[PDB]
Structures are given as C-alpha cells and as structure tokens.
C-alpha cells in the first residue's frame, strides 16, 4: 500500500495549473478543471479532435526524479468516448492513446524530439475501473497501471500521444516501491 510506495508525481496533488508541455501548444491537449465538492480543481488534460485527420498531439510532463529507483509504476485514471457514441462519420476515430518515456539527467529539457521517446504501451479502456466520488457525481474512470524500467538517468519525462481519440486524462501518478 501507500506505506511501501514513494510517490514521484501525482497530478492530483499539484497546486495550480499543471502547465505540462503540449505540442501543438493550442488546439490539441488542453487543461480542463473539474471542480470537486470543496471547489478544488481536478486538473485534467483532454483532447478530442475526432473530426480532423492526421492527429499527432503530444503532451509531456515536467522532469520527474527517479530517486534511485530503477523500476517505476505509472497509474492513469482516464475516460474515453467510444467512437460509436460520437455521431458523425469519423473514419480515423481511435479509442486508445500511446504512453512514452524519455530518460534524462537534464531537468529543464525543451523540445525533446518525438524519436527520443520510448514507447511503454498503447493504452485502451480495458476491464479495470475506479470510482471517484466528487460530490455531485461519481466519476467512473478506467484505471491502468504500467511498470517501466530499468531506469538509469537522474530522472525522466513521461509523454502521452493522441492520434485521434476523445480522451480525458483525469489522474496520473508515478511511484516506486521502497525496500
């Protein structure tokens, strides 16, 4: 449990805007706040350009220290709209997104090339869900976890690539397990 985990990043516990780096800067991944019962914002990132072709929208975290862990765990809570629930002809609509990482000793990288990112997985809605009670509503979200390693630079960046889905990333947590 949390007792044996050390959190490296938790998007839910960041104060103020996440300000993660989106490419394109506008019109792709955008920050959307969902207000919880205490009027604290849940900072989500969303993109839904299902009506436009050739989507390649990237979103990357800031630098995340690995603190001497070689194996980290990435937990994402998200929701997608199924293509069959979106009216309109959408020949290129997708229901997945891609997850990547890039290791670096440099905590202030800018414009990391697409080809520097290493793919972790294609993420889809699968069997596993969680419920997040926010007062007026209970968010029923897919929950997926992936391990990454072995890591060997001082830290890393995580990235999410959309290629034409209708996706909301509601929570991203990265942790390691401490012996």
């Amino acid at each position: 449990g949390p007792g044996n985990e050390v959190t490296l990043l938790d998007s839910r516990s960041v104060q103020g805007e996440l300000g993660w780096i989106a490419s394109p800067l506008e019109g792709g991944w955008e920050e959307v706040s969902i207000m919880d019962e205490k009027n604290t914002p849940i900072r989500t990132y969303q993109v839904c350009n299902v009506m436009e072709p050739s989507q390649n929208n990237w979103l990357r975290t800031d630098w995340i220290t690995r603190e001497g862990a070689q194996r980290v765990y990435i937990e994402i809570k998200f929701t997608l709209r199924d293509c069959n629930s979106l009216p309109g002809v959408m020949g290129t609509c997708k229901e997945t997104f891609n997850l990547y990482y890039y290791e670096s000793d440099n905590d202030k990288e800018r414009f990391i090339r697409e080809n520097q990112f290493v793919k972790i997985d294609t993420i889809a809605a699968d069997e596993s869900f969680t419920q997040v009670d926010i007062g007026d509503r209970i968010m029923k979200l897919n929950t997926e976890i992936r391990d990454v390693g072995p890591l060997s630079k001082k830290g890393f960046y995580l990235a999410f690539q959309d290629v034409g889905a209708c996706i909301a990333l509601v929570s991203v947590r990265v942790f390691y397990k401490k012996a």
Binding site: E30, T44, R81, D136, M139, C166
Partner: peptide, 12 residues
C-alpha cells in the same frame, strides 16, 4: 474540436 469535453459526464 474538442467535439466533446469531460466534465462528471462527457458532453458533446
């Protein structure tokens, strides 16, 4: 787009 935005529920 965004064609839809997720708020509690999706709205499109």
């Amino acid at each position: 787009x965004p064609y839809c935005v997720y708020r509690x529920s999706w709205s499109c």
